[PDB]
């Protein structure tokens, strides 16, 4: 689809099993989701923007839906305020910025 | 550097 | 342009007579610069982003020129790590996700 910005661009994802919403961010590097158990080994990073940085439980190669389209990449997870996904999967979906 | 430039109006 | 996402989304914008560089930003409502001396009428204000908040000067009504198209909006000045073209501009210069 192609997607305007007027408001938030909010997606449905699938993570782990379980569906949630999150927010389409080019202004990240990395995608990161709000506290959720998660299966596999992980290592801690911190992460960081306006504000400052919170730290997250990095988990690698983890497969991912973002609306409809699977990816698999780099998750975080941590007490960030909304679900975040980030360039390293935008890419993976063939999301680009038109204008 | 940071990397994640989420920002909400309040 | 069509601008994929491999890299950080940077474009030369042209605000308050200096050329700076930005992020085009699907995930911030607002457009945020770094601390500069702009002339002007302004209001306080308190902005979420991923670590917490930040305090910024609200300018309304200001000129900005992003990547060659002219716009008038907001823009708020504080400490943001770099500066981010969000959501109230992308409109404006008709920026669409597409995938």
Same mark, same amino acid.
């Given at each position: 689809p192609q997607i305007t910005l007027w408001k938030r661009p909010l997606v449905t994802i699938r993570i782990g099993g379980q569906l949630k919403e999150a927010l389409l961010n080019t202004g990240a590097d990395d995608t990161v989701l709000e506290e959720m158990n998660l299966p596999g080994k992980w290592?801690?990073?911190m992460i960081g923007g306006i504000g400052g940085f919170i730290k997250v439980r990095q988990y690698d190669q983890?497969?991912?839906?973002?609306? =409809?389209?699977?990816?698999? =990449?780099?998750?975080?997870? =941590?007490?960030?305020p909304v679900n975040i996904i980030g360039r390293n999967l935008l890419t993976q979906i063939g999301c680009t910025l038109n204008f | 550097?940071?990397?994640?430039?989420?920002?909400?109006?309040p």
């Open positions: 290592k801690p990073k983890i497969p991912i839906e973002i609306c =409809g389209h699977k990816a698999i =990449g780099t998750v975080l997870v =941590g007490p960030t | 550097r940071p990397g994640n430039f989420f920002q909400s109006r």
